[PDB]
Amino acid sequence: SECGPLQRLKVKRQWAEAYGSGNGREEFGHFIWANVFKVAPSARDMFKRVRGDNIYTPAFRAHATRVLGGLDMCVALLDDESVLNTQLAHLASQHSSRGVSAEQYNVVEHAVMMGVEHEIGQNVFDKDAWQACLDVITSGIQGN
Amino acid sequence: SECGPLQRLKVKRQWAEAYGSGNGREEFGHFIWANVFKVAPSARDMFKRVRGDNIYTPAFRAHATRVLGGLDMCVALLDDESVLNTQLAHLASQHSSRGVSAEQYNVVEHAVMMGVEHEIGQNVFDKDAWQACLDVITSGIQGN
Amino acid sequence: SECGPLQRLKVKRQWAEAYGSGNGREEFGHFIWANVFKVAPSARDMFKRVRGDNIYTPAFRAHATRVLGGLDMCVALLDDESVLNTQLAHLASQHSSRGVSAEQYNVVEHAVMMGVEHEIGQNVFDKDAWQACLDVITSGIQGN
Amino acid sequence: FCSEADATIVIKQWNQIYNAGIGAKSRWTMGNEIFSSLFKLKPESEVLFNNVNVANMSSGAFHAHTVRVLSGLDMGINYLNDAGTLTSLTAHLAAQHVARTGLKAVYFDAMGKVLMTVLPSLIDNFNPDAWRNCLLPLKNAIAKGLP
Amino acid sequence: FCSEADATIVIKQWNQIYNAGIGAKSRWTMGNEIFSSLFKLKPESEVLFNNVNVANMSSGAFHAHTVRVLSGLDMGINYLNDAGTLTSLTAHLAAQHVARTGLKAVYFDAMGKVLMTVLPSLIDNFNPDAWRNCLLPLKNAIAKGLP
Amino acid sequence: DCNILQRLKVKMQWAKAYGFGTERAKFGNSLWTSIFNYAPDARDLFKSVKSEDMRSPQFKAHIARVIGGLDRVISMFDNEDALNADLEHLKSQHDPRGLDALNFVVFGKALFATVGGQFGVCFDLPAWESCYKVIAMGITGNDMFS
Amino acid sequence: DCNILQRLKVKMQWAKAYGFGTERAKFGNSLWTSIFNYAPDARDLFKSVKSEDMRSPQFKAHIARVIGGLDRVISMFDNEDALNADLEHLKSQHDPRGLDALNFVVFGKALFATVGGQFGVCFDLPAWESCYKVIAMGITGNDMFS
Amino acid sequence: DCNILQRLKVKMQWAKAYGFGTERAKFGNSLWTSIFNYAPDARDLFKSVKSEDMRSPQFKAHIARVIGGLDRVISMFDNEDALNADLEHLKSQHDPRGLDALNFVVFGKALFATVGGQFGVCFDLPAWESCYKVIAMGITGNDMFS
Amino acid sequence: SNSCTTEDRREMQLMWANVWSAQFTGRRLAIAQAVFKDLFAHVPDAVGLFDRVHGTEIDSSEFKAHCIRVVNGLDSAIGLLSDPSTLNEQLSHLATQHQERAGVTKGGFSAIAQSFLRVMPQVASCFNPDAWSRCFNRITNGMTEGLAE
Amino acid sequence: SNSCTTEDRREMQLMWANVWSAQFTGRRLAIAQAVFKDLFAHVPDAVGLFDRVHGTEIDSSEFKAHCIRVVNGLDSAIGLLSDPSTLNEQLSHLATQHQERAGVTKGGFSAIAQSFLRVMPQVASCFNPDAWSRCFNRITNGMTEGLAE
Ligand code: HEM
Ligand code: HEM
Ligand code: HEM
Ligand code: HEM
Ligand code: HEM
Ligand code: HEM
Ligand code: HEM
Ligand code: HEM
Ligand code: HEM
Ligand code: HEM
Ligand SMILES: *[C@@H]1O[C@H](CO[C@@H]2O[C@@H](C)[C@@H](O)[C@@H](O)[C@@H]2O)[C@@H](O)[C@H](O)[C@H]1NC(C)=O
Ligand SMILES: *[C@@H]1O[C@H](CO[C@@H]2O[C@@H](C)[C@@H](O)[C@@H](O)[C@@H]2O)[C@@H](O)[C@H](O)[C@H]1NC(C)=O
Ligand SMILES: [Ca+2]
Ligand SMILES: [Ca+2]
Ligand SMILES: [Ca+2]
């Protein structure tokens, strides 16, 4: 599937519902990263500075806050190709010296998809649109 | 445990509650097949024609509709040995040229059991009756 | 993290909420042991006498009742070092001839933690306090 | 036109992707996808939009055209429960199209298939029967009198 | 002092770990952790509690002291929405501390940091801003007039 | 005036006061009840849409087209190219009718009273005055909206 | 202009939007919140009534005095002698403060949004515009309000 | 008397009748309304906390300290060491005031009426009589509470 | 309009649920056999279309299992009237199952539509023939897409 | 007291949500660019602090992406006002991001605080400047812990 103009609009609205205003964001981020470290417990080591051992701490919750904010910036820019590439390159530099594998980007990809679906319901979740447009995002964070 | 006359009656009533009238059937079928492909992702390939890659598509939802209808016919026939064997043989021919392993029939078996329990509650779920009577069903779909 | 006087108080109150008065105890115990046997299906064999094959039976539900009662006695004694060691030694003798590995005690440890969190919510669950004080409990049941 | 329960489904699904609190960029993004698809089913119809600079679908003139087309579609949808007013609204839209030379009723059939194709990609739980029950009377009322 | 919504949060989180249905053992367990921490930030202040046998923090005299300190703190918290009564309550607590020789206002600053450190280890979803907004006016009103 | 912040403000308050479904028609009826009350002479200009009976399907259709035009123009407030192109399109439609520009002043007053009366006390009247001038200037070209 | 019929309309719509009891305080707070949001620099003109904190007793007392002046001026709209005597009295209190008359234009905009937002869709904005001019002319003497 | 079972019983019923928040102050006011009604002469003993007006912040502060003292003493019922130490502390505070011990009898009666009136019919009066004697004995040392 | 509306969809699922037996085939079998008896007595050459499932022996286990499959397929379609996206996919699968069979045309579906219109009021309470047929025809329209007249 | 109360926290999230666009940067970009335009027109030497993100070219893609990051950071902090424990951690991370940059002081935050106080009423309905600044200052107090005056 392709992340076309229609899929970008659908992903935008579905993200806004799942991400919400701010009340469910702590639960939203917790659901995502509990899935990440369950599927890949070995990834916890890269999060030593933000208490990856304990995702219930305020230190990691702020990290999950920043990660979701990064996704929100990308999703809000899916209809703005020029500015989206600039912000994706900024995320790339934030992960450059961390050795994040392409396997892990897909793990977080799947957790984000399970989290949005868990937030808005399998009844409306558009898996093809979400998979194609998160590929565009993660592929930009890995340089290419 | 044995799928006797009493266990067939209990499975009938518990299936009717989980399967319902039609409103929760989409969620019921989704819960089952999300469990199937999670426990055995390799089984997705046999479902190429019905979009096994994306169980959110209308194409796969109709396939899950047919699978649940097949279970409903079998469960409704558990008290009618003669007619049940006829319908089980019809299901057997529908899977004859597909190479379905005995391991997979048990995977779907477990997903159906987790789905019914998730629908009616662990507080009332009769695991012995469900396991013994689904064995009778799957064993008939495999010829023997 | 250390199971200090403050962590013992927090674990006490959080356990009392999750364990409750008696209405949700059947669901509480089921959630725990469904996690145990899923992470370690090989552990079912040690529970032959109490129907470890079928955790829905009244026989296993009474076993889960006794296990939770044992945890309740330990948690209620976390502020009483002398009496806690006596009861922990009683639990040790109840598991002496059963060959329970240190890996399994941590599996049940994690299930209990997931069950309490599932009961009181990730929003308030204190993972460090629960991990440190359950270590004190399990380490006493293993002799040392 | 269509029933109140069907119209209720169409109106709620439409406001989901189109309302007053939606920036015009996504408005003409949907418009461009709709008309680009119409020109792939009936390439003969692209010549009819020369007055609004269809040669450049990124221009202000053509963005404004798709905006007012989608606004007319929104106006028809939001009056599905006012059959008397919808009749007058669609009669006015028909006169605005019958006067245009080169328009065939088959072009509105192709537009219907474009809408039935694009909207499920945008709308959650798109109901094609409720939409057919309401859009098809709209389509015929706008194409009433077209060759 | 502090707002009604802030006071409501402080009062509910406080009753969570301290109320009438709580045995005194956990009462002085919290008291011992609080004062032990105070003596690690300001070791000079431990001498001021010699009259209540601070040399043995397991004694009945010192357990009773921490009990009445936490009871006074509980009294201030439960009157956060009665600003007139809280003023008189804190003025009485101030006189009970100004008369004690060797007490500096900095000691109450250290007690504030001890409470901000210990309470999150005991309270679910500890709100440090709501607690700062209410405890700091309490702390200053009790330390009003201290050197 | 009508800077980018006021344009967003106007889009915000418009979407709220405009609503969905049949409330949209009630807003439009209120707008046009005010126009004809502010200037009863303007009613005779709309005999082509049966202004003699504001409940008729003919005038209800006119109401819907007008408030739909406001909606699409307000929605394009943030894109000058599309906005001016649509305002020119509306100008080419209103020019042949030889309308006194003083009625576009009356339209604005009625629009402010209807939007603000529906939106509540947080209605930003200076922003609506400035941004309605942009709309009326595009439709009439008259520099009284300068 | 503000003829006698427009004065009756304004008195009627004011009395409805103004209300009883604590509704007046809420009405006054919205009016002055809108003034300071329309023109944040005008806030520094009210340091004499502690405009730094709008919920302070000093500024709430000023709010009460202003909407009390509006209420008494509007009530006297139908007696020229008493009305002009009070406008002259209000003029003598504001003149030595060297106020830029443009702020009285901003005040009018906030008054219209507040009364209109409270009264609803049938708010007569042209009537309030013309009659507020009479008030602002009486207070400032500036022919900008002529 | 006042065995360990009665001490737990008293702690139970106290926590229920004492409540949380502002109900705590209503309980305390009721307790002291009963004391002064049972013995009007006792009111003059509390002029240092402005008993002349039981609604004053001075007497409300006294009420809070007293019922807070009951709470902490009842909470220590199960630890003799801390209990007696705090009762001695309360004794050293009440001794210099030369109080007639008959008022501590009045205090108990009012406490039973207030707790039982708030707790309901399951109030254990024998347990409260026995365990209040332990409290009054610690504060006064008078063997009339033997 | 003769369209199957959302209102008619609710009414059909009500007419269907008040007759459907969720646990025992006794009621499903009775309705199905009665429909085909009505179909065969009105279209005599239709019995030869079901030679494989013993159409002439309505009480055989082979035709009992076929009747259960037909009613199961109609039950799935009636339920999927609430989700027309999935319904359109299911009606296509049913269409190809009735394709490549000479004798299965659009005329036989109009006949079985009459069969249901005569069987259903005998077993269903509060039966609405208007609302029933509008959505029954909607269902058969998808089942007879690539069939002869 | 001038403290950011729970009441003020609710009001700020209301003032913010009624202006925030959850799907398109058009409203976020407009507010941010308008804030920095106000900041640069009041603090001329501040533009040199953003040489890396093309501060002089407010309409560049580089400064558009920076503006989106600033508003995203403020949006996360306003939401975290409901969870001050996590907020304190996020405000520390923002502090070190503004540390080790000569020219970034507590005076620039007092200036951008004025910038927001002038931009927000133009775009926000029912704007409360008192409640807004009390919690905005609470947010900046954590962002300027280890900064110069
Ligand atoms: C796929 C979308 C992702 C997004 C939107 C994202 C976003 C972010 C953001 C905004 C930060 C903050 C950086 C800073 O403030 O210095 C961050 C940090 C980090 N991210 Fe990601 N990230 C993504 C994927 C991943 C993955 C897949 C991994 C590893 C498996 C990862 C590992 C890290 C690490 C180790 C940090 C450092 C945090 C610290 O120690 O302070 N990221 N990420
Ligand atoms: C255990 C109870 C099962 C039931 C009641 C059931 C039922 C059905 C039904 C009714 C169909 C429709 C066939 C048709 O209309 O042509 C079907 C198709 C199919 N089934 Fe099953 N099935 C079961 C088990 C399984 C398992 C365990 C697998 C594989 C792991 C499987 C794989 C398939 C495949 C590949 C198709 C073909 C679908 C297509 O491509 O159109 N089935 N099944
Ligand atoms: C970690 C905390 C644990 C607690 C509080 C606990 C508690 C108990 C209690 C109270 C009994 C009842 C003994 C009796 O009445 O005779 C019991 C039995 C038993 N426990 Fe545990 N246990 C714990 C861990 C484990 C683990 C990790 C395992 C194995 C992986 C285990 C395996 C068993 C077995 C096999 C029995 C025998 C039950 C029977 O056959 O009657 N226990 N446990
Ligand atoms: C739901 C479907 C449609 C709707 C709601 C619709 C509505 C509209 C509206 C509101 C206008 C502008 C009227 C004005 O000038 O005020 C317009 C213009 C026009 N439409 Fe349609 N329309 C639809 C489908 C079609 C189709 C299928 C065609 C095929 C050729 C078509 C051809 C045109 C043309 C040529 C114009 C004039 C462009 C110009 O101004 O140069 N429309 N339509
Ligand atoms: C929230 C903080 C505090 C509260 C609520 C509090 C309250 C109290 C109370 C109720 C008493 C007993 C009064 C009585 O005799 O009836 C007391 C005693 C005392 N407090 Fe405080 N206090 C606090 C902090 C501090 C701090 C920081 C110091 C530092 C030195 C301090 C020093 C003392 C001393 C020396 C005594 C007397 C001990 C004795 O009786 O020998 N307090 N306090
Ligand atoms: C912002 C202000 C206005 C907007 C957005 C607007 C918009 C519209 C629209 C969309 C139409 C329908 C064109 C068509 O579909 O053929 C229309 C028609 C018309 N407008 Fe306006 N209009 C505005 C103000 C006015 C005013 C102030 C007057 C006169 C005082 C006026 C007089 C007319 C007339 C006479 C028609 C044609 C009625 C008919 O179709 O018979 N408009 N306008
Ligand atoms: C438009 C209708 C207005 C009315 C009816 C009105 C009414 C009043 C009244 C009754 C007072 C109290 C005078 C006293 O008792 O000393 C007052 C004071 C004042 N007014 Fe106005 N006012 C209006 C507009 C304005 C405007 C637009 C401004 C400035 C932007 C303004 C500036 C002031 C000032 C500075 C004071 C002095 C406050 C003090 O320190 O006592 N007024 N006004
Ligand atoms: C169980 C019974 C009682 C308890 C627990 C109790 C407790 C207290 C407490 C905590 C204080 C505050 C001491 C301080 O902070 O300085 C106090 C003060 C006082 N009590 Fe009692 N009390 C009791 C009975 C009585 C009775 C029966 C009387 C007299 C009839 C009495 C007379 C006083 C007086 C005069 C004061 C001082 C008032 C002042 O501060 O000016 N108490 N009591
Ligand atoms: C609402 C009306 C109908 C429904 C829901 C329906 C449904 C079904 C279903 C589910 C099957 C099973 C196919 C399989 O398991 O592979 C089937 C088979 C069949 N149907 Fe229908 N059907 C309908 C009407 C008709 C009519 C009117 C005819 C002929 C005039 C017809 C002819 C057949 C034939 C020949 C078969 C295959 C027989 C066999 O497999 O031995 N159907 N139908
Ligand atoms: C509420 C106020 C502010 C917020 C929420 C905020 C937030 C942010 C954020 C999220 C970043 C991105 C850092 C990164 O991605 O690594 C950033 C960068 C930066 N900020 Fe702020 N900021 C604020 C005020 C200020 C002020 C007042 C100044 C200077 C006077 C300033 C100077 C900078 C600089 C120099 C950078 C780095 C530029 C670059 O990376 O090219 N910030 N800020
Ligand atoms: C197509 O139009 C694009 C959009 O630019 C806008 O519209 C054009 C018509 C001009 O008015 C321009 O000033 C506007 O900014 C252009 O960017 C693009 O270059 C155009 N393409 C071609 C091939 O001309
Ligand atoms: C410290 O105090 C501990 C607590 O015992 C109780 O308090 C003391 C003061 C005595 O009154 C005793 O009778 C009480 O049971 C003692 O257990 C401990 O030995 C004391 N420590 C030292 C070093 O004296
Ligand atoms: Ca990927
Ligand atoms: Ca099996
Ligand atoms: Ca362990």
The domains of chain J are located at 1-149
Pair of tokens at residue H119? 């707790």
List Cα–Cα distances, F43 to A10, B68, E60, F47, in angstroms.
Answer: 44, 64, 92, 8
List Cα–Cα distances, J97 to A94, B77, J73, J85, J143, in angstroms.
Answer: 12, 69, 11, 19, 9
Pocket test for ligand 8, best of H44, H83, H93 (most atoms within 8 A of CB): H93
- Maximum Cα–Cα distance for chain A, whole Å? 40
The phi, psi pair for E78, rounded to 5°, reads -75, 0
Tell me the CA–centroid distance for residue A130 and ligand 13, in Å: 10
In our burial notation (b when 16+ CB lie closer than 10 A, e otherwise), range C116-132 reads bbbbbeeebbbbbbbbb
Structural biology method used: X-ray
Q: Which residue has the tokens 């999950």?
A: A64
Chain C contact set for B122 (CB, 8 A): 27, 30, 34, 56
Q: What whole-number distance in Å separates Cα of residue G90 and Cα of residue G107?
A: 15
Chain D contact set for J21 (CB, 8 A): 23
Q: Is D65 annotated as a binding residue?
A: no
Q: Which candidate, C141, J86, C57, places its Cα nearest to that of A62?
A: J86
- What residues of H are designated binding site for heme b? 48, 89, 93-94, 107
Q: Which residues contact H3 (CB under 8 A, 6 or more apart)?
A: none
List Cα–Cα distances, I76 to B51, I98, I111, in angstroms.
Answer: 19, 16, 21
Q: Which residue has the tokens 């006119």?
A: F62
The phi, psi pair for F95, rounded to 5°, reads -55, -50
CA angle I32, I37, I42 (to 5 degrees): 125
Nearest-atom number in ligand 7 for the CA of G108 is: 1
Give how far E44 is from chain H: nearest CA, Å.
25
Are A9 and D29 within 8 A, CB to CB?
A: yes
Q: Which candidate, H15, H33, H47, H56, places its Cα nearest to that of H106?
A: H33
Q: G118 in contact with F at a CB cutoff of 8 Å?
A: yes
Q: Among I2, I5, I86, which would you mutate to test the D interface (most chain D Cβ atoms within 10 Å of its Cβ)?
A: I5
Q: What whole-number distance in Å separates Cα of residue I46 and Cα of residue I35?
A: 13
Domain count, chain E: 1
Q: Which candidate, G54, G71, G75, places its Cα nearest to that of G20?
A: G71
Pair of tokens at residue A99? 């050795």
Q: What whole-number distance in Å separates Cα of residue C122 and Cα of residue C130?
A: 13
CA-based end-to-end distance of chain H: 9
Q: A104 in contact with D at a CB cutoff of 8 Å?
A: no
DSSP string across H16-58: HHH-STHHHHHHHHHHHHHHHHH-GGGGGGGGGGTTT-TTSHH
Q: Enumerate neighbours of I (3 or more CB pairs within 8 A).
A: B, D
> How many Cα atoms within 13 Å fall on the side-chain side of residue C81?
3
CA-based end-to-end distance of chain I: 23
Closest ligand by atom to B142 CA: 2
**Would you say D128 and I84 are in contact if contact means Cβ atoms under 8 Å apart?**
yes
Q: Among B35, B106, B128, which would you mutate to test the C interface (most chain C Cβ atoms within 10 Å of its Cβ)?
A: B128
Q: What whole-number distance in Å separates Cα of residue G10 and Cα of residue G74?
A: 8
**Would you say B90 and B84 are in contact if contact means Cβ atoms under 8 Å apart?**
no
Pocket test for ligand 12, best of E52, E57, E59, E66 (most atoms within 8 A of CB): E59
Angle between helices A5-19 and A25-39 (to 10 degrees): 110
List Cα–Cα distances, C74 to C106, E24, E73, E123, in angstroms.
Answer: 16, 20, 31, 21
Q: What whole-number distance in Å separates Cα of residue F46 and Cα of residue B100?
A: 74
Q: B–C: how many Cβ contacts below 8 A?
A: 12
Give how far F37 is from chain G: nearest CA, Å.
9
* D56 touches ligand 11 (CB under 6 Å): yes
Three-state helix/strand/coil letters over I2-46 = CCCCHHHHHHHHHHHHCCCCCCCHHHHHHHHHHHHHHHHHHCHHH
Displacement of CA F12 from its chain's centroid (Å): 16
In chain A, how many H helices and how many E strands? 6, 0
Strand, helix or coil for residue H68: helix
For chain H, how big is the Rg over CA atoms in Å?
15
Tell me the CA–centroid distance for residue B129 and ligand 14, in Å: 12
Protein residues near ligand 14, an ion, with CB under 5 A? B 106, 109, 135
Q: Which residues contact G98 (CB under 8 A, 6 or more apart)?
A: none
The domains of chain H are located at 1-146
Q: Is F89 annotated as a binding residue?
A: yes
CA angle J34, J37, J39 (to 5 degrees): 110
Q: Enumerate neighbours of A (3 or more CB pairs within 8 A).
A: B, C, D, J
Chain J contact set for E137 (CB, 8 A): 1
Pocket test for ligand 1, best of A95, A105, A107 (most atoms within 8 A of CB): A95
> How many Cα atoms within 13 Å fall on the side-chain side of residue E144?
15
Q: Which residue has the tokens 């109106």?
A: D11
Q: What whole-number distance in Å separates Cα of residue C60 and Cα of residue E12?
A: 39
Chain B contact set for C56 (CB, 8 A): 122, 125-127
Pair of tokens at residue E137? 């006016």
Q: Which residues contact A136 (CB under 8 A, 6 or more apart)?
A: A3, A78
Q: Which candidate, I42, I50, I62, I53, places its Cα nearest to that of I107?
A: I42
Q: Which amino acid is at B140?
A: G
Q: What whole-number distance in Å separates Cα of residue A26 and Cα of residue D105?
A: 54
Q: Which residue has the tokens 């990308």?
A: A74
Q: Which amino acid is at F83?
A: L
**Would you say J69 and J50 are in contact if contact means Cβ atoms under 8 Å apart?**
no
Tell me the CA–centroid distance for residue A121 and ligand 1, in Å: 26
Chain A contact set for B54 (CB, 8 A): 127-128
Q: What whole-number distance in Å separates Cα of residue F22 and Cα of residue A144?
A: 50
Q: What whole-number distance in Å separates Cα of residue F116 and Cα of residue D142?
A: 35
Q: Which candidate, G90, G92, G125, G97, places its Cα nearest to that of G111?
A: G125
Displacement of CA G24 from its chain's centroid (Å): 13
Q: Which residues contact C65 (CB under 8 A, 6 or more apart)?
A: C25, C29
In our burial notation (b when 16+ CB lie closer than 10 A, e otherwise), range E19-57 reads ebebbbbbbbbbbbbbbebbbeebeebbebbeebbbeeb
**Would you say F18 and F27 are in contact if contact means Cβ atoms under 8 Å apart?**
yes
Strand, helix or coil for residue D85: helix
Check contact A-D (3+ Cβ pairs < 8 Å).
Answer: yes
Q: C26 in contact with B at a CB cutoff of 8 Å?
A: yes
Q: Which residues contact G14 (CB under 8 A, 6 or more apart)?
A: G70, G71, G74, G115
Q: Which candidate, F82, F88, F76, F67, places its Cα nearest to that of F131?
A: F76
Q: Which amino acid is at C33?
A: W
Q: What whole-number distance in Å separates Cα of residue B34 and Cα of residue B36?
A: 6
**Would you say C87 and C73 are in contact if contact means Cβ atoms under 8 Å apart?**
yes
Q: Which candidate, E4, E10, E30, places its Cα nearest to that of E129?
A: E10
Pocket test for ligand 9, best of I31, I91, I97, I116 (most atoms within 8 A of CB): I97
Chain H residues in contact with chain E using a Cβ-Cβ cutoff of 8 Å: 11-12, 14-15, 18, 20-22, 24-25, 57-58, 60-61, 64-65, 68-69, 71-72, 74-76, 78-86, 89
**Would you say G86 and G73 are in contact if contact means Cβ atoms under 8 Å apart?**
yes
Q: Give the residue on B whose Cα is nearest the Cα of C58.
A: B123
CA-based end-to-end distance of chain G: 9
**Would you say D115 and D103 are in contact if contact means Cβ atoms under 8 Å apart?**
no
The phi, psi pair for D99, rounded to 5°, reads -65, -15
Q: What whole-number distance in Å separates Cα of residue J4 and Cα of residue J128?
A: 13
Q: What whole-number distance in Å separates Cα of residue D29 and Cα of residue D19?
A: 14
Check contact H-B (3+ Cβ pairs < 8 Å).
Answer: no
Pair of tokens at residue E62? 């010192």
Q: Which residue has the tokens 């939001």?
A: D78
Q: What whole-number distance in Å separates Cα of residue I24 and Cα of residue B86?
A: 16
Q: Which candidate, J75, J92, J100, places its Cα nearest to that of J144?
A: J92
Is D21 buried (19+), middle (13-18) or exposed (0-12) by CB count in 10 A? middle
Are F82 and D82 within 8 A, CB to CB?
A: no
Q: What whole-number distance in Å separates Cα of residue F36 and Cα of residue F41?
A: 7
**Would you say F27 and F63 are in contact if contact means Cβ atoms under 8 Å apart?**
no
**Would you say C15 and C70 are in contact if contact means Cβ atoms under 8 Å apart?**
no
Pair of tokens at residue D87? 């009749």
Q: Which candidate, D133, D144, D146, places its Cα nearest to that of D1?
A: D133
* D60 touches ligand 11 (CB under 6 Å): yes
Chain A contact set for J61 (CB, 8 A): 82-83, 85-86
In our burial notation (b when 16+ CB lie closer than 10 A, e otherwise), range A26-54 reads bbbbbbbbbbbbeeeeebbeebeebbbee
Neighbours of G103 (CB within 10 A): 17
**Would you say D30 and D144 are in contact if contact means Cβ atoms under 8 Å apart?**
no
Are D24 and F78 within 8 A, CB to CB?
A: yes
The phi, psi pair for D54, rounded to 5°, reads -65, -20
